[PDB]
Amino acid sequence: QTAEVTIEDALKVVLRTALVHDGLARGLRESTKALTRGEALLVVLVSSVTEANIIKLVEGLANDPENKVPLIKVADAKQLGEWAGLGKIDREGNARKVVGASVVVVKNWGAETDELSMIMEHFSQ
RNA sequence: ACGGAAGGGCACCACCAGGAGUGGAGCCUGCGGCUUAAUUUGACGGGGAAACUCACCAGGUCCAGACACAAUAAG
């Protein structure tokens, strides 16, 4: 469905603070295995991943989702890597560069419970 | 200080009178020695002793570096 900027930013900060809570699965494989075991409480998929194959497989389970499968889209790959600790680590004075991720799962919420509840309930519409 | 000048004790780790002996024998056990891949080692070691005790040998295994720092990395 139609993705807004508030939704995507609140989402990347959800990945940011639920990353600290030791509750993420950062990668295509770890997130697909996260969704096969019923461990994904919310999944984040990047809207700019070049190869569409694995996505054409995840977009078949996105258009027809299960009762325990909520998803949501972000804007870029390198940045969704960044908020998951990967991609980049940029704070007021410090910087460190890695490479960006395609999809990331939130297994344990913790410090972002009401935020992932809001994000998942506004994607219900 | 030192005496190997002399004088006393005062003693079965000294001598008399003995007693039992040991040293000779086989076996035990400790020390040295040689031999050994090692025959662990101190000068009784609570040192009793096939694993343990092993501290010595022939080989087969693990587990290494706090960290800092440069690349990689999430496709």
Residues A121, A125: Cα–Cα separation, whole Å: 7
Residues A72, A45: Cα–Cα separation, whole Å: 6
Method for this entry: cryo-EM
Number of domains comprising chain A: 1
How many Å does it take to go from CA A32 to C1' B10? 106
The domain of A122 spans: 1-125
Residues A99, A35: Cα–Cα separation, whole Å: 23
Q: For residue A89, give the CATH number of its domain.
A: 3.30.1330.30
> Strand B footprint at Cβ < 7 Å?
A 26-29, 49-50, 77, 81, 85-87, 96-103
Contact criterion met (CB below 8 Å) for A25 and A104: yes
Which nucleotides of chain B are near protein (any atom < 7 Å from a CB)? 72-75
Angle, helix A5-20 to helix A113-122, in steps of 10 degrees:
150
How many Å does it take to go from CA A96 to C1' B70? 13
